[PDB]
Subunit: 505 residues, 4 copies
């Protein structure tokens, strides 16, 4: 049957269905079964009111428990190509307890499983046990942790928010892995310029057991069994072609500039916030500052952090500044040096996160107050976490939409890993402080003002600093272009254009 | 279709339906659609048991969510003349979060909206964001704040309670705005006496973009496009006629008397009570006193007030007296100087307001205790907030009814703004400490004992102190008369009669 | 229609239905309508499973709200002979808030009411307001307060528990009021011996507006319009007959003995316990002691009591001893001088009373522990409050049943007042510390050992100390006999027999 | 009808049904009726999805309350051979309050009961009252207390977990009591070797009123009316046969070795944990240590223990070590000397036990952390309580299953006592610190290396130290064998084999 099976119901279900409909469109549609502990007719009513285009995909609803074998047989569990275990809205530990029981149930199916299991985990501290009992069958996506990592990346580089939304979801372009036997024996530097409609980003190396190497050496020779990781519009839109003519040349300003210290504000005590502090300490330049404004009394913050595994005495790049107060109280916020922050993250506080409507209401209240306080005392990225994707969609015609990062990104990550389990490791590396990551780079590293050259020519210059050039944003364009369709044609570039690369630190 | 659409269900729904039925009666009835997340047959059952006269208006019920476009299409959202977003019973922040999502949903309707959106807001701190995203489509009515303002006005002038109930609801007379081209070129002083069945109160000034000027200058000349604001019995009961014969004369006692200080008691810590203290400080004579009797420890009251934006060190007219105690405990209440207060407001405490039945039970318990304590220690307006309009209606044949102000006034305000969005600014001014307000004035300012004159003659005398005379209450009458039908006939007035005016401070 | 209408559903409903079925049996049955906010078919199912004999009474169920006039019309509210407003299980203030709204609704019925309204009140502090708005239509029975008073009476006189159960319910004999014109002009002392099958206890005095005088003067002459209060088996079982021959004689030992001090234990902090302490202080001999064992810290008990209106510095007969502890913890209980108490009351603690199953579980746990502690440290009335009548009935074949007093007594009181509203004042007096009350008296006051005399002869001796003799308990009988059928026959009495009287203090 | 009647519904129902199906299989099936306060069709749906073999037993579902006689008649309460009162999931006191009311209801059935009542009690402190009112009809199984006792036994002797699971459930072998008149007059030492397919363990002694004597004297002569207690595969698989030929011989090493002190860790504050500490103090060698790691502040632990009846100053064999911390926080756990414990019990904490899914999630989190901490600091039985049997079953293909003891054992105990009420006393003795218990013993007490002998010959040697030999575990076998089928055949034993005995201390 090779359908997608979704176990559960949550605020993320509609956005996940939308992603899978987009992924299936190139096939003419596919089949999705949803099984939840709800009345089947109510499920069908809700699905029938969803406002996106199903693009030929059929959605079937069944009522039942993932712990009951007779219920799993109702949705042909052993023939699904992927099984997605959706987290329950509300308390993270309760959702993760259900996830563990569900994975154990699925591993007990005696006919076996045709596909893999994608588990939406709500708390990092519960991931190891799920991975232990799920073995080779399971991929975990820790929703809470991924969102924290993306918020930090987008706070540090404004403009990555749009890029990450584009790449993590199936609209526009995204990562695909495919085997191309006709490229066996070619150097990676030539593979890079072999696809009119794709940008190679890595190689699945057969001699390493299928490990994906992002940003490999230009001198790597593709071997039998290797596969290519690309960014492309869809799984079927790209193919290798004869090598184009690409002039070679040197980087004008191949410089590493001293990184300046950053001052970041976190509003709210997020569950497991020590994990975000760890990521930030590994990401910022020395002498940076993290301010934490929240209602936890200062004298007890250290215990929370040390109990979460963070030794603040051994932070390398950041100093911590603690301020106590209520993030929806104007008087408390205005005591902060709001104008001095390079970025401000408004986080879902652990005291209210179990209710998405309450958490999101507080986050938007804080956003409005920070903006209004600053406007009123006239003579900085602000990013606000939104837990319900519906609220993000409802904000989409407002200016507010530019200031929010939502759990829709979790639905996108789940759909990516459902469609190819191997992409989970690629995303993990790009979300991690180690290895490769995405960066937005000024044009004067790569070219001179008005220089006439092709995207491929810039790409080959970028290889001289070990970067994969994946896109650009033109000086007065609203949106970056990833995997630009016109790669061989020459244009006149501006020093105000910017380039999007995958790069090591 | 031009129907009224109500989104939601609450304790206020019946009283709102009643108001709209009264407003529609002059048309022979209209149509109201109610959509809520309830079983349609249960909604219909409840509507069919409501005890007021529908007066030809038809009520249609549908089950659905205001965030779901297919549900909005079921109630012809794009053809409604007004959409009313009713607050949810219970927690104010949760209700306001729903309100914001609903306004965003309505603004997303791609066919557009024929009418305006009236949003019942539960907390003033959430109003700005709703106004920002709703733009030109939205009128907000902040129920909690309006009730606080009305309680203060009625505590300061006993007898305004009946007047405000009469004017804010569609029974008796109320505000209407209409264009009268035949009055172009006339002075406002002549417009004032041009309507046998109405009292002009202001002008919608076309050259100010349609801003309504309450109580304009007698010398203002009506221009093309201007409209007249009147108080009248219904939208169609009044029209201009030839100018009547009105004797002119002077005010006998056009004096401004020194205002005496007032001592006011607030029982209970109302949510956002600092907003009421602000209004009171701007309303009372110097050297006045506000006593706050409630269970919040004295040492922490200042923080609550400063966090709500109130700087008590810069109050101009009132001193604050703090007493700690439980407002349903006789022993605590009897320590207060109950006999010395000019007025006592029994407020819904923020600790119980999320349950209307609990809050109203405490308010009535306090009312009875205050009266009984005073009666028992024999050898003052008391106003009690009631959150459920049903309880106010059930009290209507009891003496208790004279001591209660209820959320029925919110239903009336919502219906007024639903019927003409421009009235929201008029009500805002009359509820505000700035600009014009209603006052009850002694007769000896305007006439001598037994003087024989017409209502119009008194009105023209009142213009000499920049007042609009809107009604009277005769010396031994139970009720004031607003917009009295007999305006040209002479009667013999008593110095014990009183006059109702709109006036600046 | 003249039916009984019950508004509500609670744990007391079955026992109330049983009482009304017993009261109606002499008519051949009657009709009871029950209206509650429940599914009608579920109500009917529950009624059809009740295990007592309906004795010809028909029970009709309807679904609806007592605040909705259309629902009240469904149960013919204006034709009912009595309307009983049953308290809701759980929180007392919420139940009383519903009661107030229901009384207001009933007073608004424009066709008027044929009968009276009996309101089950849960908290004494809410009674005055209900009485104020209900006027002449309402009788209140404050369930919580009545049970406290009965527990004190039964703790002080073991054997009154069975007597009160017999008299307050319709099994056996109970109070009836009826007019007997043929007794006009007779002295009360002769009325007393005029009814073979009843005992006159008082007179409804027409010249006092129908006030019932319990235990009147023997010389009172019945006037036209007066009615007789009797104890009898049923409303129709008794009638006056020619005066019997009754020998007169003197009391052998008409002595008042010095009352000895009592030591009483209250286990648990009962809601409004100050009301019980007040009753006890007025009931006990000087130098008595009340021990209060409960978990409220000693330092804060005084505030609870003074806030409830009790001035402990002005207690007349009791001293208070405070002990802190948990009444289900053996170690805490065994620190008490359990063997030294004249009686122990195990009260439903205010911390758990909102759940009858939890409260009753704690009360029975305490009962078992007190008995077991005493038995284990070998080399006193114990009375336990039970909130659910079903639990009392389930205990009825156990020895435990002798140690429990339950809310079934509330159902009995409600049925008594439903059947004749005038009985509420009689019960109030007998439950009150003022006026008349029931007492169990030793035989040697009235007769000598082996004296051969009739019940009537003893009754006339008892009149010489202003007592109404209503029954006896023979030396080795399990049960007292009230209104004994054989009143003229002589028997040989024992000084070990006891007599039941109504008497002033 | 002689069916089994189960009153209630809980997480244990499926495992109880499975046990009863196994017990009934030898009859070809039987009948089980389940009555709960649930929709009958939902009950039937759930039963129809259970995944074990019903083995010919029919399950009938009815909706109803055990307190309602009409409902009890629907399931033929008076003809059932056993009635099982299943505890409610969640709060123990509420479940036990229901149990008491249900037992009272059953004792009120006027047709009487054919069988006995098995009551699942959740808290030991509530057992005495249930036993008092249930009299001769009731057997109580205190689930919480039994699980604590089994966890201690299995922590002290690894390998008893599998043995107890085998013997307490109906798979494999278990205890049976039956009368064998042909054995009257035989000595117990000969009865012991009379059953090819069973091991006699005790005698039901008719002259003691039917008291079961476990491990009687070899010289006891069976009398008329006595019955034999055996371990056998099923009730019908065993019978006496002529005495086999059994060589006699002496024990090689009949030594009592000095018992070494043990160090035990309890993680979590279990409800009524003092009861486990009492059992442990009576079970361990002198100078043993109990460490209690949990979040209760040290200064208040003593009160909890003394209020539960434990005098820590008079412990005989253990010292208590108190550590404060959170059992799911790695940093707190790693401060413990984890490597030094002879056994670690992870207990369901009283703060979360009312939710089985939360409690079990914490227990598994602690298990994983303890194992991972130890593995990570490289250059001991661990037993975890699981409250939901479904979770234990879901873990059954994981290694984790070896580390869990679950409430499935409660279902097994309930089924054992349902099938023969007399087994409750046998289990009580084996679970008690007094009398006989099961022990795993080294082979060199009984035989020499390579000695060729039969199981019966070893059994008769074991009688010389007053032990009943019930099974063995061979040196490299995964599982012990209880009641081995091949008892007369000789094999060559290893000093690495172990023997399972019933023995006094
Ligand atoms: Ca595709
Ligand atoms: Ca965590
Ligand atoms: Ca795409
Ligand atoms: Ca109208
Ligand atoms: Ca506010
Ligand atoms: Ca009107
Ligand atoms: Ca009768
Ligand atoms: Ca009270
Ligand atoms: Ca009777
Ligand atoms: Ca069997
Ligand atoms: Ca306990
Ligand atoms: Ca077996
Ligand atoms: Mg962690
Ligand atoms: Mg504010
Ligand atoms: Mg009181
Ligand atoms: Mg105990
Ligand atoms: Na994409
Ligand atoms: Na990375
Ligand atoms: Na009006
Ligand atoms: Na104003
Ligand atoms: Na009676
Ligand atoms: Na009395
Ligand atoms: Na077994
Ligand atoms: Na034992």
């Amino acid at each position: 049957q090779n359908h997608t099976l979704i176990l559960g119901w949550s605020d993320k279900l509609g956005s996940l269905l939308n992603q899978l409909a987009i992924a299936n469109e190139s096939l003419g549609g596919g089949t999705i079964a949803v099984m939840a502990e709800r009345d089947k007719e109510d499920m069908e009513l809700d699905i029938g009111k969803m406002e996106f285009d199903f693009k030929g995909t059929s959605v079937i609803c069944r009522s039942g428990s993932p712990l009951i074998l007779a219920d799993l047989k109702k949705v042909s569990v052993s023939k699904a190509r992927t099984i997605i275990v959706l987290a329950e809205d509300g308390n993270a530990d309760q959702s993760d307890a259900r996830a563990l029981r569900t994975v154990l149930s699925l591993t007990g199916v005696k006919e076996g499983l045709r596909g893999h299991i994608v588990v939406e985990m709500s708390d990092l501290d519960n991931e190891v046990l799920v991975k232990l009992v799920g073995g080779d069958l399971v991929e975990t996506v820790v929703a809470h942790d991924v969102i924290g990592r993306l918020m930090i990346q987008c706070a540090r580089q404004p403009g990555l928010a749009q890029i990450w939304e584009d790449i993590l979801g199936f609209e526009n372009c995204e990562f695909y892995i495919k085997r191309w036997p006709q490229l066996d024996g070619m150097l990676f530097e030539d593979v890079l310029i072999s696809f009119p409609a794709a940008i190679p980003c890595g190689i699945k190396v057969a001699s390493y057991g299928g490990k994906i190497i992002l940003n490999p050496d230009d001198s790597y020779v593709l071997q039998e069994g290797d596969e290519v990781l690309v960014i492309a519009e869809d799984d079927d839109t790209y193919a290798p072609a004869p090598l184009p003519m690409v002039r070679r040349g040197s980087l004008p300003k191949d410089f590493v500039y001293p990184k300046s210290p950053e001052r970041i504000l976190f509003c709210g005590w997020r569950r497991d916030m020590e994990d975000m502090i760890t990521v930030l300490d590994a990401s910022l330049a020395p002498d940076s500052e993290l301010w934490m404004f929240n209602d936890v009394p200062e004298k007890e913050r250290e215990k929370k952090l040390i109990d979460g595994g963070l030794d603040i005495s051994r932070l390398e790049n950041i100093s911590l500044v603690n301020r106590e107060g209520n993030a929806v109280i104007r008087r408390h916020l205005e005591s902060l040096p709001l104008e001095s922050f390079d970025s401000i993250l408004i986080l879902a506080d652990e005291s209210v996160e179990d209710s998405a409507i309450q958490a999101d209401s507080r986050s938007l209240a804080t956003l409005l107050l920070i903006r209004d306080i600053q406007a009123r005392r006239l003579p900085t990225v602000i990013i606000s976490e939104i837990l319900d994707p519906r609220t993000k969609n409802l904000l989409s015609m407002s200016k507010i939409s530019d200031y929010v990062l939502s759990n829709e990104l979790v639905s996108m990550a789940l759909a990516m890993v459902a469609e190819d389990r191997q992409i989970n490791d690629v995303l993990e590396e790009l979300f991690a402080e180690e290895g490769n990551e995405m960066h937005i780079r000024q044009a004067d590293i790569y070219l001179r003002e008005g220089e006439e050259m092709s995207f491929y020519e810039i790409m080959l210059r970028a290889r001289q600093r070990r970067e994969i050039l994946i896109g650009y944003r033109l000086a007065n364009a609203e949106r970056a272009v990833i995997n630009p369709p016109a790669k061989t044609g020459r244009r006149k570039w501006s020093l105000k254009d910017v380039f999007v690369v995958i790069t090591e630190k």
